Design an enzyme around this catalytic site. Structure first.
Site, short mmCIF file in Angstrom:
data_model
loop_
_atom_site.label_atom_id
_atom_site.label_comp_id
_atom_site.label_asym_id
_atom_site.label_seq_id
_atom_site.Cartn_x
_atom_site.Cartn_y
_atom_site.Cartn_z
N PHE A 66 66.36 51.22 -13.26
CA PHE A 66 66.99 50.50 -13.73
C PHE A 66 66.58 49.72 -14.83
O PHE A 66 65.70 50.22 -15.26
CB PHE A 66 67.06 49.09 -12.49
CG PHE A 66 68.44 48.60 -12.03
CD1 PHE A 66 69.01 47.49 -12.62
CD2 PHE A 66 69.34 49.39 -11.25
CE1 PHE A 66 70.36 47.08 -12.18
CE2 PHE A 66 70.53 48.98 -10.80
CZ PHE A 66 71.13 47.92 -11.34
N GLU A 87 75.23 48.35 -13.19
CA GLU A 87 73.87 48.97 -14.14
C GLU A 87 73.28 50.29 -13.46
O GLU A 87 72.39 50.96 -14.03
CB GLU A 87 72.85 47.86 -14.52
CG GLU A 87 71.90 48.45 -15.42
CD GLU A 87 71.16 47.04 -16.03
OE1 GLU A 87 71.86 46.40 -16.88
OE2 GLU A 87 70.18 47.01 -15.67
N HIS A 124 78.45 37.49 -16.99
CA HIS A 124 77.90 38.00 -15.76
C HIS A 124 77.02 36.95 -15.19
O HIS A 124 77.41 36.69 -14.01
CB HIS A 124 77.20 39.25 -16.12
CG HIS A 124 76.56 39.97 -14.78
ND1 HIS A 124 77.31 40.93 -14.09
CD2 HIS A 124 75.46 40.00 -14.25
CE1 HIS A 124 76.34 41.22 -13.14
NE2 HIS A 124 75.54 40.69 -12.98
C1 LIG Z 1 78.89 38.39 -10.56
C2 LIG Z 1 78.07 39.51 -10.09
C3 LIG Z 1 76.64 39.18 -9.77
C4 LIG Z 1 75.88 40.14 -9.36
C5 LIG Z 1 76.39 41.66 -9.36
C6 LIG Z 1 77.62 41.92 -9.62
C7 LIG Z 1 78.41 40.87 -10.10
C8 LIG Z 1 80.09 41.10 -10.20
N1 LIG Z 1 75.65 42.44 -8.67
C9 LIG Z 1 74.22 42.12 -8.58
C10 LIG Z 1 73.30 43.40 -8.16
O1 LIG Z 1 73.78 44.24 -8.13
N2 LIG Z 1 72.07 43.14 -7.93
C11 LIG Z 1 71.53 41.87 -8.10
O2 LIG Z 1 70.39 41.57 -7.77
N3 LIG Z 1 72.37 40.71 -8.58
C12 LIG Z 1 73.98 41.04 -8.65
N4 LIG Z 1 74.53 40.03 -9.13
C13 LIG Z 1 73.97 38.63 -9.37
C14 LIG Z 1 73.80 37.94 -7.86
O3 LIG Z 1 74.64 38.75 -6.91
C15 LIG Z 1 74.78 36.66 -7.97
O4 LIG Z 1 73.77 35.84 -8.72
C16 LIG Z 1 74.57 35.99 -6.54
O5 LIG Z 1 76.14 36.25 -6.04
C17 LIG Z 1 74.30 34.40 -6.50
O6 LIG Z 1 74.36 34.26 -5.19
P1 LIG Z 1 74.49 32.70 -4.76
O7 LIG Z 1 74.27 32.46 -3.36
O8 LIG Z 1 73.42 31.73 -5.50
O9 LIG Z 1 75.63 32.15 -5.18
P2 LIG Z 1 77.14 32.70 -4.57
O10 LIG Z 1 77.01 34.18 -4.06
O11 LIG Z 1 77.98 33.01 -5.61
O12 LIG Z 1 77.83 31.94 -3.29
C18 LIG Z 1 78.07 30.67 -3.72
C19 LIG Z 1 78.52 29.75 -2.51
O13 LIG Z 1 78.43 28.44 -2.61
C20 LIG Z 1 79.67 27.98 -2.10
N5 LIG Z 1 80.14 26.89 -3.00
C21 LIG Z 1 80.25 26.74 -4.10
N6 LIG Z 1 80.80 25.49 -4.63
C22 LIG Z 1 81.10 24.89 -3.40
C23 LIG Z 1 81.49 23.43 -3.35
N7 LIG Z 1 82.37 22.98 -4.14
N8 LIG Z 1 81.22 22.91 -2.12
C24 LIG Z 1 80.95 23.56 -0.90
N9 LIG Z 1 80.56 25.07 -1.21
C25 LIG Z 1 80.59 25.60 -2.37
C26 LIG Z 1 80.46 29.04 -1.94
O14 LIG Z 1 81.35 28.89 -0.67
C27 LIG Z 1 79.79 30.23 -1.90
O15 LIG Z 1 79.90 30.74 -0.65
#
Ligand SMILES: *Cc1cc2c(cc1C)nc1c(=O)[nH]c(=O)nc-1n2C[C@H](O)[C@H](O)[C@H](O)COP(=O)(O)OP(=O)(O)OC[C@H]1O[C@@H](n2cnc3c(N)ncnc32)[C@H](O)[C@@H]1O
Ligand SMILES: C/C=C/CC/C=C/CC/C=C/CCCCCCC(=O)OC[C@H](COP(=O)(O)OCCN)OC(=O)CCCCCCC/C=C/C/C=C/CCC
Ligand code: HEM
Ligand SMILES: CC(C)Oc1cccc(NC(=O)c2ccccc2C(F)(F)F)c1
Ligand code: SF4
Ligand code: F3S
Ligand code: FES
Lengths: 102, 239, 138, 613
Positions: D122, D258, D356
């Site tokens: 990677f 990636e 990203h």
């Molecule tokens: C954008 C992205 C990131 C990514 C990736 C591909 C994409 C398109 N591929 C990755 C990979 O192959 N390997 C890796 O190590 N990382 C990769 N990333 C980055 C990573 O996946 C992200 O940073 C990750 O998704 C973050 O996880 P996290 O649990 O911290 O955040 P989330 O998955 O986006 O979940 C957010 C949750 O919070 C709840 N939420 C949000 N706002 C509220 C409010 N208003 N009230 C109540 N709940 C809320 C949502 O429901 C959601 O479930």
């Protein structure tokens, strides 16, 4: 484990391959012995057929008991009626033979 | 200009006994995205900000935008807009489901069924967990392919006619596929009792191989084949 | 909360509410695998109605089978009328027989892909027409 | 008053967010024995962790013999020496322990002939402290790693008595005299407002990618928890540092992993040259994300664009075998024909640098504790925790290393659970909240529910998204940034002339997205102002006028005959951002970066150096 619903499913497939085998067998050998086994296969497979229909559309817990009893009563009369036809009449093999050349 | 017609199912639970009625929206396709979700976003952002719908990844790998488009249950971000301008795209929610608002179904029962199968690795001995990785060959690994990919969009289960009439007691394709997903997994030890949990006329045996589940799957998966494969295990497992 | 409790609380919130059921049969696209499944159930019930009606008549109605045929013989024996009536017996019978095999093939776990469903769906449909026309001329 | 029904819930721990880090923190607390409630606006599966395709980094040593101490070096070097090394120590050490943990939960990792977890090369990873060459420590579930990660975390979470508030939008933090008491949240199913009080509160809401026009992130990545800490008056860290993923579709902005570059995918410009070898000689096309995307956006400047309008570049998979694309990369293969109309086996993918990752977020202790900055010193906010993309323990620093966020999720999500379990016991006194607490949170909601202005929510959103894309891009000059700052400030004064249409209680998507807009703006203000103030080129933040990498010393030459620069002279420090909610006034101060590790003997502290691959 007490596989009651699993063994019931197998039985349905067992009578199916039996009923599929008996239809050409009745054409080849239209004996009295074939008449009773065909009457047994037609009724049983048919009973388990409607049994699946009932458990699908009937809501249950009140009408389920009545429909399953009403089907069992009909199936009992069907098998006995067919056995009566095989014993006191020409039989279901000879019945088709006469009907088809009409 | 390039006008495309969209007829969408609408129901407001705040309009005092409002009837479920269709609403027509016109969109310039030349100034819009290729997918149905892009069009649904466009009317929300421009025409009428009252259309309520679930959306997230816009990528086809979360299963939020799952709905009925032109009689088919697929993802709105995967299915592209019909280029034929002389046709109106009929947009409906998932079939035979409790409507919360516009195109938003109550999936509480759907997720609860997925909880009732226990979708996690169960070992007889749990004292050696979180210290050494469990062994699985590339040959045993390939048996999970086409099963783990399920995104739980609820398209296959809601397309099943058996799940319409018997949604309460029958688990449905999506859930059953996941039950199978943990069955063939060489790591899992509780394979027998997972089958024993289906020992009733409704849990598994309400499937009659109607095959609407595979035909509508957005990810191209085969739940019906996986269900029929369970039925074979059910009749062959000993003890 | 448990899975069993989540289901029980689901129905209490929906059955006692103003929430409507989403359209199902009115809106969904007509599939060949779906339509052929309905016809299998249709022919299943129709055949079981015939088998039961035959055995039930042997008990309730007086007279033997030889005399019962004479009532059919009493009315003018139309060659194009008897053939059509005889065709309407083997048509629902042979469809269920050929499609019954297709279900039994599925129970072996074979031929469960979309192209295979549409192929075997036509093969069963064609075999039905041939076996129904063929047996009516026996 | 009397309009909304307030339903107070009492728990031991509240976890806002049900993603990767959210679930691990949530179920881990109940697995420890706490009465844990999990609040989420989406269903746990719909979380944006499913979109993750690349993999999860762990020095297990299956392809070759490996050491986690080398993975420490790769991350800190990648962080451009802005990353806190104590947090990197903790992440990399129990990296193999926490991945095995996931495999033991039931995660169907890709396999080899040995039977162990498949690791892969990677961007920016190297053996023997950089000298040993290419490293293979990216554990992957055949290009669907993040999806399978979330499902096996969610699946395992049903083993415990965790409460799940599914589709409950969190509005503001419950705060009493600096101490966090829980969350005031809005129910979406009926429209009521719930006050969930607990001794500890974990925030795992992810990034704020929706601040820009073009991003790989979901429609829901709106940095809600990041802007929740904002309204509480607590600082936000390194918000100007926004990572640009080099490979993203020109159309809808979807991600091509990636892992494509890690397997053998090469980037080729319109001229036909392998241009990535020209910029970076050592790591070539598989360099860090702050160098690869930097090279791609520079190709547009000399008019060397591949596209029909000459704007994007290509990711070539023409030379790759079709045998590998079906086993190692099936997820990107299918999604290529959907959004681009391109098969991976015969023609390259149209790629473009897009928003990203957000390494900057909520200031966080290596334990998971939220840090406030008082009198030039770090203080732990009582009963408040943060893990994941929303958090900033600064394990990623100025530039996130490839496939490190999913690790950042599971490790620090676990750490948030352990730091609660070892500090206080389950069943301990839950601190009583005021009867009229969260009054302004409800009063805020009531204004936008009956909003009658002139500018629509989505029209103001597009004015924000396009302003950030042009002013705070990959390259940004002081004059360009200053114009953006006073432009975003003008857009904040428009948040009172907003127009809404829906006025119901049940599922008001016209209201929740406008709440997201409030959260997006507050994140946008701190991003643009923090960028204009920083006078250096470090990691993802690259100034054209300030190309220099400003440290305490000139680390290019030997360190001895050189006097140390004062703290308020160099730029090797964390950007802490405060913003007044009423006026939109951004005020900035800075805190020192942590250089010391958890144990010097077990893991050596790596000093700053010249950064280039
Ligand atoms: C954008 C992205 C990131 C990514 C990736 C591909 C994409 C398109 N591929 C990755 C990979 O192959 N390997 C890796 O190590 N990382 C990769 N990333 C980055 C990573 O996946 C992200 O940073 C990750 O998704 C973050 O996880 P996290 O649990 O911290 O955040 P989330 O998955 O986006 O979940 C957010 C949750 O919070 C709840 N939420 C949000 N706002 C509220 C409010 N208003 N009230 C109540 N709940 C809320 C949502 O429901 C959601 O479930
Ligand atoms: C309940 C039963 C009620 C009876 C009504 C059912 C009539 C439908 C039968 C469909 C089968 C086609 C008949 C073919 C035929 O010509 O008869 C065979 C005949 C050729 O003689 P041959 O001596 O072989 O002729 C020599 C020249 N080839 O005679 C036989 O050999 C007898 C075999 C008949 C077996 C068919 C059993 C069908 C049961 C299904 C019931 C469906 C009810 C609706
Ligand atoms: C010899 C040829 C036949 C074969 C191979 C056969 C086989 C089958 C099979 C496998 C099924 C289950 C389909 C499913 O999975 O849902 C079925 C259904 C059924 N069959 Fe038959 N059968 C035959 C003849 C008959 C006859 C003569 C009758 C009339 C008594 C009959 C009555 C029914 C009924 C009522 C059903 C239930 C309908 C349904 O659930 O789809 N079958 N048949
Ligand atoms: C869109 C319309 C055609 O859709 C319908 C309407 C009514 C019945 C059905 N079809 C069944 O109901 C059916 C058919 C065969 C086997 C089992 C079933 C079962 F289980 F009950 F679901 C489908
Ligand atoms: S099996 Fe397919 S159609 Fe069913 S929920 Fe999963 S992805 Fe959707
Ligand atoms: S459609 Fe339904 S009855 Fe069947 S094969 Fe799929 S579960
Ligand atoms: S929105 Fe994620 S699947 Fe369409």
């Amino acid at each position: 484990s007490s596989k009651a619903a699993s063994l019931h499913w197998t039985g349905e497939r067992v009578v199916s391959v039996l009923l599929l085998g008996l239809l050409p067998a009745a054409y080849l050998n239209p004996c009295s012995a074939m008449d009773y086994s065909l009457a047994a296969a037609l009724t049983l497979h048919g009973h388990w057929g409607i049994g699946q229909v009932v458990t699908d559309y009937v809501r249950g817990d009140a009408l389920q008991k009545a429909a399953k009893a009403g089907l069992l009563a009909l199936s009992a009369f069907t098998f006995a009626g067919l056995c009566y036809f095989n014993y006191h009449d020409v039989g279901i093999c000879k019945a088709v033979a006469m009907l088809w050349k009409l | 200009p390039r006008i495309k017609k969209f007829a969408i199912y609408r129901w407001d639970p705040d309009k005092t006994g409002d009837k479920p009625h269709m609403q027509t929206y016109e969109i310039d396709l030349n100034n819009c995205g290729p997918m149905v979700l892009d069009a649904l976003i466009k009317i929300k952002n421009e025409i009428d900000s009252t259309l309520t719908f679930r959306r997230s990844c816009r990528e086809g790998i979360c299963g939020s935008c799952a709905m009925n488009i032109n009689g088919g249950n697929t993802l709105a971000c995967t299915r592209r807009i019909d280029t034929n301008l002389d046709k109106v795209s009929k947009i409906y929610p998932l079939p035979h489901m409790y409507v919360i608002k516009d195109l938003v179904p109550d999936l509480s029962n759907f997720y609860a069924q997925y909880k009732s199968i226990e979708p996690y690795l169960k070992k007889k001995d749990e004292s050696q967990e979180g210290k050494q990785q469990y062994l699985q060959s590339i040959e045993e690994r390939e048996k999970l392919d086409g099963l783990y990919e399920c995104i739980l969009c609820a398209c296959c289960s809601t397309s099943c006619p058996s799940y319409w009439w018997n949604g309460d007691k029958y688990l449905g394709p999506a859930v059953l596929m996941q039950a199978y997903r943990w069955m063939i997994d060489s790591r899992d030890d509780f394979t027998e009792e997972r089958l024993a949990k289906l020992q009733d006329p409704f849990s598994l045996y309400r499937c009659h191989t109607i095959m609407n589940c595979t035909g509508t799957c957005p990810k191209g998966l085969n739940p019906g084949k996986a269900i029929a494969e369970i039925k074979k295990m059910m009749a062959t497992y000993k003890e | 909360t448990t899975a069993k409790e989540e289901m029980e609380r689901f129905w209490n919130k929906n059955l006692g509410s103003n929430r409507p059921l989403s359209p199902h049969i009115t809106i969904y696209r007509w599939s060949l695998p779906m339509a052929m499944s309905i016809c299998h159930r249709g022919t299943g019930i129709a055949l079981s109605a015939g088998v039961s009606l035959f055995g039930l008549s042997a008990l309730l109605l007086p007279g033997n089978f030889e005399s019962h045929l004479e009532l059919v013989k009493s009315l003018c024996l139309g060659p194009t009328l008897i053939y059509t009536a005889k065709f309407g017996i083997v048509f629902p019978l042979m469809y269920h027989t050929w499609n019954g095999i297709r279900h039994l093939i599925w129970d072996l776990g074979k031929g469960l892909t979309i192209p295979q469903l549409t192929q075997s769906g036509v093969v069963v449909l064609i075999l039905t027409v041939l076996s129904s026309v063929g047996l009516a001329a026996m | 008053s009397t309009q909304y029904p307030v339903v107070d819930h009492e728990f031991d721990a509240v976890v806002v967010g049900a993603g990767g880090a959210g679930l691990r923190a949530a179920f881990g607390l109940s697995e420890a024995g706490f009465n844990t409630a999990c609040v989420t606006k989406l269903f746990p599966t719909r979380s944006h962790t499913v979109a993750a395709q690349g993999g999860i980094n762990a020095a297990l040593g299956n392809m070759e013999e490996d050491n986690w101490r080398w993975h420490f070096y790769d991350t800190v070097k990648g962080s451009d020496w802005l990353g806190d090394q104590d947090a990197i120590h903790y992440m990399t050490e129990q990296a193999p322990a926490s991945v095995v943990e996931l495999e033991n939960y039931g995660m169907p990792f890709s396999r080899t002939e040995d039977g162990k977890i498949y690791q892969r090369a990677f961007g920016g990873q190297s053996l023997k402290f950089g000298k040993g060459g290419q490293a293979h420590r990216c554990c992957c579930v055949a290009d669907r790693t993040g999806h399978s990660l979330l499902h096996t975390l969610y699946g395992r979470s049903l083993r415990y008595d965790t409460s799940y508030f599914v589709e409950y939008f969190a509005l503001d933090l419950l705060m009493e005299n600096g101490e966090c008491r829980g969350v005031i949240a809005l129910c979406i199913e009926d429209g009521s407002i719930h006050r969930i009080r607990a001794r500890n509160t974990v925030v795992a809401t992810g990034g704020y990618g929706r601040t820009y026009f073009s991003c790989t992130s979901a429609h829901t990545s709106t940095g809600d928890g990041t802007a929740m800490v904002t309204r509480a008056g607590l600082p936000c860290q390194d918000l100007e540092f926004v990572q640009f993923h080099p490979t993203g579709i020109y159309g809808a902005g979807c991600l091509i992993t990636e892992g494509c570059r890690g397997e053998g995918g090469i980037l080729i410009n319109s001229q036909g040259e392998r241009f990535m070898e020209r910029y970076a000689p050592v790591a070539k096309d598989l360099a860090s994300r702050d160098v690869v995307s930097r090279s791609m956006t520079l190709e547009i400047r000399e008019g060397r664009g591949c596209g029909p309008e000459k704007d994007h570049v290509y990711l070539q998979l023409h030379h790759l075998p079709p045998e590998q694309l079906a086993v190692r990369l099936p997820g990107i293969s299918e999604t290529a024909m959907i959004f681009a109309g391109v098969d991976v086996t015969k023609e390259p993918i149209p790629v473009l640098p897009t928003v990203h990752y957000n390494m900057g977020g909520i200031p966080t202790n290596y334990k998971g504790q939220v840090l406030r900055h008082v009198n030039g010193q770090d203080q732990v906010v009582p009963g408040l925790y943060a893990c994941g993309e929303a958090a900033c323990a600064s394990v990623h620093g100025a530039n996130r290393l490839g496939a490190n966020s999913l690790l950042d999720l599971v490790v620090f999500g676990r750490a948030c659970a352990l730091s609660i379990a070892e500090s206080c016991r389950p069943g301990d006194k839950v601190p009583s909240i005021k009867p009229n607490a969260g009054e302004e949170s409800v009063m805020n909601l009531d204004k936008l529910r009956f909003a009658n202005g002139t500018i629509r929510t989505s029209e103001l959103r597009l004015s924000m998204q396009k302003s950030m894309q042009s002013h705070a891009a990959v390259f940004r000059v002081g004059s360009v940034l200053q114009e953006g700052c006073e432009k975003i400030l003008r857009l904040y004064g428009d948040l009172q002339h907003l127009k809404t249409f829906d006025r119901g209680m049940v599922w008001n998507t016209d209201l929740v997205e406008t709440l997201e807009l409030q959260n997006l703006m507050l994140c946008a203000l701190q991003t643009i102002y923090g960028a204009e103030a920083r006078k250096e080129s470090r990691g993802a933040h690259a100034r054209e006028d300030f190309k220099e990498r400003v440290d305490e010393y000139d680390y290019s030459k030997p360190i001895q005959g050189q006097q140390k620069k004062p703290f308020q002279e160099h730029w090797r420090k964390h950007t802490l951002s405060y913003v007044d909610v009423k006026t939109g006034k951004v005020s900035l101060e800075y805190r020192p970066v942590i250089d010391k590790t958890l144990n010097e003997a077990d893991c050596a502290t790596v000093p700053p150096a010249i950064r280039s691959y």
